[PDB]
């Protein structure tokens, strides 16, 4: 059934599962034409496919060429997402294929269900969580590889860097969701918090700064404060 606050620990068990977020697949700028009409211009997008236990991120880059001469692009985007997740699964050895795929948006259920018809043993699940994976394009290195892409490309990352050496998957996911929530609510403030102290760098092979255990606690506190402040302003509470 639906993934929710109650059944949260299931993410961190030994059943392989993937989250699929399609928010950043079809991305546009809205602009005026010469005649004063409005037009969209597509920009490169990505499928965010994440193993929440391992941190393995399958970033499928969606090049604007995909949309050329197609109609109803917001609908096609859901099917293109399902097609690419389907191709990813079939590329993985049997023992690495997921037992569940959890979609962050219910509109992805039917497309993925039809694309995975011949995988009757893979459960396609919605979630009641409002996960902040839309904010993935606020991670500089992920934004950089999407916007530089000249063709369809799959890039593999570990979104937890080396955290699993020191913390559990549960803790790593909670830190990831806190960072992304902060980046979604106030990108400028979140980024200032992460990159202020210039002596803490991002390793070439990492996405996030090389914080010590104590420094992560300070960062996490600063992210939580940021999120509640913006909640205050938002609701005049």
């Amino acid at each position: 059934g639906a993934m929710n606050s109650s059944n949260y620990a299931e993410l961190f068990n030994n059943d392989i599962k993937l989250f699929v977020d399609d928010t950043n697949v079809y991305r546009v700028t809205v602009h005026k034409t010469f005649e004063g009409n409005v037009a969209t211009k597509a920009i490169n997008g990505c499928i965010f496919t994440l193993n929440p236990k391992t941190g393995h991120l399958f970033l499928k880059i969606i090049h604007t060429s995909v949309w050329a001469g197609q109609k109803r692009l917001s609908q096609l985007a859901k099917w293109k997402t399902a097609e690419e997740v389907s191709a990813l699964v079939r590329s993985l050895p049997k023992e690495e294929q997921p037992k569940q795929i959890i979609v962050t948006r219910k509109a992805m259920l039917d497309p993925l269900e039809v694309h995975m018809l011949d995988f009757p043993n893979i459960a396609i699940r919605p979630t009641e969580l409002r996960l902040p994976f839309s904010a993935a394009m606020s991670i500089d290195k992920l934004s950089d590889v999407v916007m530089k892409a000249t063709e369809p490309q799959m890039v593999l990352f570990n979104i937890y860097d080396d955290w699993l050496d020191r913390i559990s998957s549960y803790t790593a996911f909670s830190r990831l969701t806190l960072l992304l929530r902060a980046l979604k609510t106030n990108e400028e403030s979140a980024k200032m918090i992460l990159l202020s102290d210039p002596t803490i760098t991002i390793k070439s092979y990492h996405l996030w700064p090389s914080f010590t255990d104590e420094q992560w606690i300070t960062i996490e506190s600063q992210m939580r404060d940021l999120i509640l402040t913006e909640y205050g302003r938002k609701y005049n509470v």
Binding site: L76, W79, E83, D110, P111, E113, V114, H115, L117, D118
Partner: protein, 300 residues
């Protein structure tokens, strides 16, 4: 004009014949139904006064044999049986008519309702959906499950409707996932019409039989089958114009005949709203859309 005699009516029962019904009292001298139009299938159906859970009946065609009803006090139901002795049967029928113990099939000359509901229904196809080859007539009741319902327990007593599943290998060509799911023309025209039904008459005959089983017996799986067969046409961009015109007529008479008080359990909001307002065929069911808007504006 044919006759279905009854041995007797030992238990109080509401008897249906097609869209007509009459109440018979316990041990009322009732010996059957005469003046039944030749040329159509018919359904005789029963609801006991004591137990309205006993909703059950028999599809038959008078051209296939001499059929009568007899109450079985062991199994506690009115059973259909065939009389192979033509002379004993003519004899019995003549005597009950002479004694005027039979009700007349109460058809109005102008009234084409039953023809319109059964246009494509044929006894040979009914007997493939309801499997009991020793009898020429087919028993259906409220509780019987469909083969599809049984996949998601007794196969002898099931309704063998053609399985329709929009999210299945049969429905979707590999590489045409989005195309085939949003436009079901492939599934309708190649898989179902050309592959399984062979023609639109067989397809319509199953759709009409499913409807009638839903209406007369409140058979839930039949209702599912009726909606699925409608939805598969409405969800197809490419449907022969003669099929659209005939479907409009079929559905018009079904909606006209449906008892007003049953529209809430017998009509699926989603399918009808999608067929009349969202689907490729939203503008192709003029008669159906007008009667639905005038008779069930609430559902929509």
């Amino acid at each position: 004009m044919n006759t279905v005699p009854f041995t007797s009516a030992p238990i109080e029962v509401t008897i249906g014949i097609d869209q007509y019904s009459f109440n018979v009292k316990e041990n009322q001298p009732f010996h059957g139904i005469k003046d039944i139009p030749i040329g159509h299938v018919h359904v005789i159906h029963f609801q006991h006064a004591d137990n309205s859970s006993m909703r059950y009946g028999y599809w038959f065609d008078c051209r296939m044999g001499n059929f009568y009803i007899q109450y079985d006090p062991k199994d506690g139901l009115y059973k259909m049986m065939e009389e192979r002795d033509g002379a004993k049967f003519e004899n019995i029928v003549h005597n009950f008519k002479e004694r005027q113990m039979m009700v007349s099939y109460p058809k109005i000359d102008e009234d084409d309702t039953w023809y319109n509901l059964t246009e494509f229904v044929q006894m040979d196809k009914i007997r493939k959906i309801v499997r009991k080859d020793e009898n020429q007539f087919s028993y259906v009741d409220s509780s019987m499950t469909t083969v599809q319902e049984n996949e998601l327990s007794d196969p002898a007593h099931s309704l063998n409707y053609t399985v329709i599943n929009f999210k299945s290998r049969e429905a979707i060509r590999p590489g045409h996932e989005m195309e085939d799911f949003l436009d079901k023309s492939y599934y309708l025209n190649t898989v179902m019409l050309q592959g399984i039904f062979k023609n639109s008459s067989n397809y319509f005959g199953e759709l009409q039989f499913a409807f009638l089983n839903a209406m007369f017996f409140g058979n839930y799986g039949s209702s599912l089958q009726w909606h699925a067969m409608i939805e598969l046409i409405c969800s197809s961009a490419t449907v022969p114009k003669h099929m659209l015109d005939k479907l409009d007529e079929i559905l018009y008479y079904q909606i006209k005949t449906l008892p007003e008080q049953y529209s809430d359990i017998l009509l699926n909001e989603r399918v009808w709203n999608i067929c009349l307002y969202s689907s490729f065929q939203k503008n192709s069911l003029h008669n159906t859309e007008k009667i639905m808007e005038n008779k069930y504006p609430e559902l929509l």
